[PDB]
Design a binder for this molecule. Sequence first.
Ligand SMILES: CC(=O)N[C@@H]1[C@@H](O)[C@H](O[C@@H]2O[C@H](CO)[C@@H](O[C@@H]3O[C@H](CO)[C@@H](O[C@@H]4O[C@H](CO)[C@@H](O)[C@H](O)[C@H]4NC(C)=O)[C@H](O)[C@H]3NC(C)=O)[C@H](O)[C@H]2NC(C)=O)[C@@H](CO)O[C@H]1O
Length: 327
Amino acid sequence: NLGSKLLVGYWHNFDNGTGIIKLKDVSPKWDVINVSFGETGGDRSTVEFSPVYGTDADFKSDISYLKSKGKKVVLSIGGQNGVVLLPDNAAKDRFINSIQSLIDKYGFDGIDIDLGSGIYLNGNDTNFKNPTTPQIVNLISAIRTISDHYGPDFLLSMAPETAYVQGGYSAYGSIWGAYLPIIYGVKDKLTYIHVQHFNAGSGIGMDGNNYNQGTADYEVAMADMLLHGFPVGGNANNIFPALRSDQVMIGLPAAPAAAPSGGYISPTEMKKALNYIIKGVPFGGKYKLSNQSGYPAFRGLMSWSINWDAKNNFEFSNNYRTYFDGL
Ligand SMILES: CC(=O)N[C@@H]1[C@@H](O)[C@H](O[C@@H]2O[C@H](CO)[C@@H](O[C@@H]3O[C@H](CO)[C@@H](O[C@@H]4O[C@H](CO)[C@@H](O)[C@H](O)[C@H]4NC(C)=O)[C@H](O)[C@H]3NC(C)=O)[C@H](O)[C@H]2NC(C)=O)[C@@H](CO)O[C@H]1O
């Protein structure tokens, strides 16, 4: 079903100046389309979604079309202007029910967790294998419940910011490391994770060195932490285990403007990072990969976004599709 080298692209269910792309006009180079976004109202727990164009039937039909072409269409929950709060079981149930309703209604292939607020590790929540914070416990539970409610081809992805994942190397509390229990809690159902390697400033690798976003070294350092695992919160006895290589992707801006706070990397530089991550071929960078000979099963690239890509001469899709096809 799903290929071993993927391009996952976010699709704007809204017009932010880059315009609307009808689903059938989405470049075939994208293997997975993350429809953005499912959003909540007053109760911050019931997720709603209405297509930006066409009737509900029309939209479902376009999705069915994409699916017939081998593409996956995923519902992304978030993001910048999305918020899900599950303080208790009642909220969790509204969340589960609303999501399942949407999946059925439109025929989504799965869900993408793209929540960048309302997620914190409470005081005393110190063990990523056994979280205690309601938001986190309930999210894990809801995700597992939803996943179990659908067949083997259900797709589960997530796009946390680096502080929530790799940031766990520095601290475990508040937002720092906060997605680690989520990842660990659903690892057996996780298709892949694509951390947002952008609007991130700098990041500390497993070598204790600081790297700047938008550089080949940074891309390798951040991905390697998921490919290899790493000690959490300065505790050598608290190691976050490696994910399967096929569960690891990297999230990138399709264009400089797609990440106004920085993060964009030129395909030329990114290919150096990819060749190092995948084939173990160095490029003279400062960061030394955990595995000398690479992680060939590395899953691919995610991008914000399909709409930005189309506005930027299809630079992202053309460059990386050709790269991965060439493997
Ligand atoms: C806790 C936390 O959120 N961390 C800080 C961020 O808040 C802060 O700014 C936010 O950065 C994130 C990316 O890390 C960003 O969300 C992602 O980035 C793109 C833009 O680069 C977002 O695209 C926007 O989506 C909304 C709809 O949700 C559109 O209305 C808007 O037009 C889009 N903008 C553009 C340029 O296209 C995406 O939502 C999301 N990317 C993905 C893959 O989902 C937030 O937008 C940022 N929020 C703010 C405050 O602007 C970050 C940098 O300041 O620093 C973190 O520490």
